[PDB]
From a paper:
Drosophila has two isoforms of Arc, [name] and dArc2, with low sequence similarity to mammalian Arc, but lacking a large N-terminal domain. As opposed to the corresponding mammalian Arc lobe domains, which are monomeric, the dArc lobes were all oligomeric in solution, indicating a strong propensity for homophilic interactions.
Each monomer consists of five helices in an orthogonal bundle fold, and the structures are highly similar to each other. The dimer interface is in both cases formed by α1 and α3 from each monomer, and the total buried surface area at the interface is ~1400 Å2. Both interfaces contain four hydrogen bonds and four salt bridges. The interface is conserved, displaying only three conservative replacements between the isoforms (A125/L170/F172 in [name] to S112/F157/Y159 in dArc2). (D) A comparison of the dArc-CL crystal structures with the same domains in dArc capsids. Both the [name] and dArc2 C-lobes closely resemble their counterparts in the capsids, with an all-atom RMSD of 1.75 Å2 and 1.13 Å2, respectively. CD spectra of the dArc C-lobes are similar but differ in intensity, suggesting that [name]-CL is less folded in solution, despite the very similar crystal structures.
Author numbering:
A (entry chain A), B (entry chain A): 4 to 86
Amino acid sequence: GKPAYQIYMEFFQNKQDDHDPIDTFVIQKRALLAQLPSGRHDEETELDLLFGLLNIKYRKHISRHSVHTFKDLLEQGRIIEHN
Amino acid sequence: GKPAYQIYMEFFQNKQDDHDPIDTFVIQKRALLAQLPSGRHDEETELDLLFGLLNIKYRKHISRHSVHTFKDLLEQGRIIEHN
C-alpha cells in the first residue's frame, strides 16, 4: 500500500466542504485510516485526527468531547443535517 | 493543554518553507507532538506524521524509508543544507 506519511498528508489535505454529507466525508477519511498499519491508532485517536477537518457547520453544534465513537459523530451529524 | 484534534490541525497546517532550516522546523513540529497524550505515538509514527510536511528540498534526497529516527533525519538534512 501507500506509505503512511502519504496517507497522513492526503487525509489532512482536504477539509469537509459545504456540499459534502458527513456520512460520505467520514467514509472517505476512514478509508484512508484503514490503510495505516493495523492496530496503530485507536478510535479516540482516529476521531482526534478527523475532527478538525469537519465543516464548521457540524463543529458549531458538536464539540469533540461530546462524541466518543464514529457512530456517535455520524448520529449527531445526521440530525444536524436535518435540524 | 490544547485538545488533540487542534494540535493535529496545527501540525498539518504549515509545511516547511524554503527559508526554514530543518532543525527549527523539526523543533516546532516536535513541540506540537509533545502536547499529544504521552505514549500515544511511537517515533516511527511521529516521523510518518512529519515527513510529508518537509520541504521537497529534503525529500528529493531523503526518502522516508531511509531514516528510522529523528536523529537520522536531522543528521542527513543538515548535510543536505551544506551539500
